[PDB]
Write a protein that binds this ligand. Structure first.
Ligand SMILES: O=P1(O)OC[C@H]2O[C@@H](n3cnc4cncnc43)[C@H](O)[C@@H]2O1
Ligand SMILES: O=P1(O)OC[C@H]2O[C@@H](n3cnc4cncnc43)[C@H](O)[C@@H]2O1
Ligand SMILES: O=P1(O)OC[C@H]2O[C@@H](n3cnc4cncnc43)[C@H](O)[C@@H]2O1
Ligand SMILES: O=P1(O)OC[C@H]2O[C@@H](n3cnc4cncnc43)[C@H](O)[C@@H]2O1
Lengths: 201, 201, 201, 201
């Protein structure tokens, strides 16, 4: 009722904004589809809801909502549950559409991404080309090295992702320094399958 | 009327969120009970209300609301009323449920807690085990030493607590340096009843 | 209509909050009176309103609203209008009730106050006692010296004041360093009529 | 419907605010006209709308909305599209009325402005006087030199501008250092047509 009504009302406002700015019909349809994939017909003031709770309830909720994400991703599945919880509570859900450039090579990276569902293409100017899918993650190398993105990453399907900002990534790896090395070893692994090599790792 | 309606409406939204994410029935009931204990059937935009007032009225209100807390806790009861008021105005009310881990040993501490009503268990790996209840406080040692939590603390009953963040704790002990020593002397006292000893105090 | 309704609705919420916390009848009446003096039966989301405007309109409005304040206070009346405008745009309107301690001696000062209407008493432990009224200001010495308040200041009547925070006071005196000396000369003047003397001025 | 209603309701609130503060009839009319020019009968919570989207959609929208601005301004039109997008996503739309002083000489500059539509006068005490119009920009020199504004700039017509804050201007020129030199070369050009000369450029 009230969450469904909230969705309908919020979408009406998006339509009037698009109408105001006279966006073309193909772009409006892409926004409509994004909305349906992202919100699935219900909208919540989530910050407000979880802010009404306490630490333990929020932590229980985020663990329940991400059981699949956690269990299918070896880095999370075998790690200390408190590190997991600390990551989970900082993740932000994002949806991307086919063809979207999630990350552009050469730019400065502010976040990494965990793939809950979807396939992405990792792209470099040197044509060395890979897929990542459910249970994997990407965008981490730049966070480790504070460098520039080492590849472009493009959505091949609709992608349901969870992102983590650089500040949060760093806040969490302070408390649990052991897990930084796990990311590095995979990062090194990945760079060496595309000709790169950082002294920094 | 309007605060009761606000509670009912806000809770409906929590139900639709829980329904959306398909939380199980036991967890929904725990959220329901938390809500009833925490808000007691009325909801307020408190920040907005007190922001409409001035310093003196806010200070009078917070002193009236915490008379019991202040009078039953020797550190507050015998202290300079301006220090009390300065602490009181920074406290945030929190409710925890039986079994909840309020604090985990080894983690980094961002806040301490004053028990208005309830019983908690202080737990260490070395089995040295104590209760704290109404009129006591905990979580202060880490704030004093910027170290890691020296114990776990678990709720035994429903707990009505007031928390104070590390930044506020520090802001207040700047203006009133005399009261830091009162916390330290009890902190030292507490560590020596569990085999620990900090040079820092 | 809508501002009057906003006032009535907001006050109803204050009543239910006071009722919830069981504040006594004398304190509720004091809150009622404060509300009537402060909002005068209409409420506005002012931040939102002025945020909908531009710099020039906001600056024209604040100059029109404070004509009396500006004209009756020699420091503002004879100063560069751009300095005035820059101060005015940072002022926050506050109402205090008789007996209220606006400032306590010994504490750390975060703001100064311009009296639009009312009388206040400047109080020191050494009994040296003065009145300030319409067109005057107070609380400035601490901002100049970053020291501790040199006196207490208490409301004798209902007081309509405009406050300026330490950060804003400093932001403005950067751009217009000439006006700091005007405050200092009056500050020095004031300290020497109560036995104090700062090398800092 | 809902955006038009939002406009009507928001304007009613502006009227009651103006009525409360007893602004004169000429100033009320100027506010009415500003409102009509600025919002054109519809209001949106834009931050909320675009926050509901993702990076790629926001970037597509801002590029579509500013096609004219981009195409008519050589600095944007011939630049790397990613630099353009990065600027565009930080621009804030502003409307000014004839006679408004957008910038005052001598003051400290916090933003620059891109003229989508309108004419402005660049004014200096030394009477050296120029017009800028659609496709041009101004207020950049101070951002480059962190100095004081080198001229006043006044609106001659209704002006539709996009502003960029100093922090954003700097954030963008970090990622794309090549474009700072393009601004400098025009800045130098401009200063030398009014007798000034900065070693800093
Ligand atoms: O540099 P980033 O922050 O942003 C681009 C990302 O692409 C991923 N990547 C790079 N070479 C790869 C080889 N194989 C799989 N994945 C790869 C990796 O997560 C990079 O992190
Ligand atoms: O280390 P913290 O920040 O977080 C865990 C808290 O447990 C409390 N504590 C430790 N030994 C204790 C012995 N007796 C009573 N209370 C005790 C004390 O407040 C600790 O502060
Ligand atoms: O120290 P503050 O920040 O806070 C207390 C204020 O009291 C005012 N004051 C002090 N001696 C005074 C003598 N005469 C008039 N006014 C006086 C002055 O504005 C002080 O600034
Ligand atoms: O100093 P600002 O930050 O603020 C005042 C602005 O006036 C513009 N300006 C100065 N001399 C000019 C000559 N011709 C055209 N435009 C001019 C230029 O953008 C200046 O940047």
């Amino acid at each position: 009722d009230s969450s469904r009504r909230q969705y309908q009302e919020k979408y009406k406002q998006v339509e009037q904004y698009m109408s105001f700015h006279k966006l073309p019909a193909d772009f409006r349809q892409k926004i409509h589809d994004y909305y349906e994939h992202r919100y699935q017909g219900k909208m919540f003031d989530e910050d407000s809801i979880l802010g009404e709770l306490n630490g333990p309830l929020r932590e229980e909720i985020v663990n329940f909502n991400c059981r699949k994400l956690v269990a299918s991703m070896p880095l999370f599945a075998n790690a200390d549950p408190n590190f997991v919880t600390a990551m989970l509570t900082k993740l932000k859900f994002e949806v991307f559409q086919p063809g979207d450039y999630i990350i552009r090579e050469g730019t400065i990276g502010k976040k990494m991404y965990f793939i809950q569902h979807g396939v992405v293409s990792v792209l470099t100017k040197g044509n060395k080309e890979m897929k990542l899918s459910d249970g994997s993650y990407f965008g981490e190398i730049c966070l480790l090295t504070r460098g520039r993105r080492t590849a472009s990453v493009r959505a091949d399907t609709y992608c349901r992702l969870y992102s983590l900002s650089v500040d949060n990534f760093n806040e969490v790896l302070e408390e649990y320094p052991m897990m930084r090395r796990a990311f590095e070893t995979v990062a090194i692994d990945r760079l060496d399958r595309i000709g790169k090599k950082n002294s920094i790792l």
